[PDB]
Amino acid sequence: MLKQVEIFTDGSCLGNPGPGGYGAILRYRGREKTFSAGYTRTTNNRMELMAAIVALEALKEHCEVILSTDSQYVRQGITQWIHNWKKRGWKTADKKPVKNVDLWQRLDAALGQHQIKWEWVKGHAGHPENERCAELARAAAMNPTLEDTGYQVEV
């Protein structure tokens, strides 16, 4: 039994906007849970974020997590953006809502419930788990069955 929750995530999109999907593997309690869904019209950035959201919202209790992902998008947000966006009420320099605020807020809400350690990996050098996430993400993108109601073109 592992003493830390381990999450692996990836997302993929066939357009901008186009069919996308995500794959996330969660090692928790003593089980390995795999999550994957496809959206008819979305973006690659929204799928990377959606993959982390889904895994984290699957945790019912406060946990110690290690999230491994190659998303530059998540990495940039976690490390350079989110802290300053919160100070600014989630507005850009020109006072408009930040792009994908819906998902960033939803991620934020999940983050604050656990003790997380982020593992930024190189796509070309991932764990077999990262590689499976991509497979899942790809498959999902060829069979979308959900609507990304949050997706906008505007902001």
Long-range contacts, stretch 108-116, CB < 8 angstroms, 24+ apart: 108/82, 110/52, 110/53, 110/56, 110/57, 111/56, 113/56, 113/59, 113/62, 114/5, 114/56, 114/59, 114/62, 114/63, 114/64, 114/65, 115/62, 115/63, 115/64, 115/65, 116/65, 116/66, 116/67
Contact indicator for 20, 14 with CB cutoff of 8 Å: yes
Count CB neighbours of 2 within 10 A.
10
Angstrom distance (rounded) from CA 132 to CA 44 = 17
Angstrom distance (rounded) from CA 132 to CA 136 = 6
Could you tell me which CATH number the domain at 1-155 has? Answer: 3.30.420.10
Angstrom distance (rounded) from CA 152 to CA 43 = 10
Domain boundaries along the sequence of the chain: 1-155
Angstrom distance (rounded) from CA 155 to CA 148 = 15
Chain-centroid distance, C-alpha 11: 7
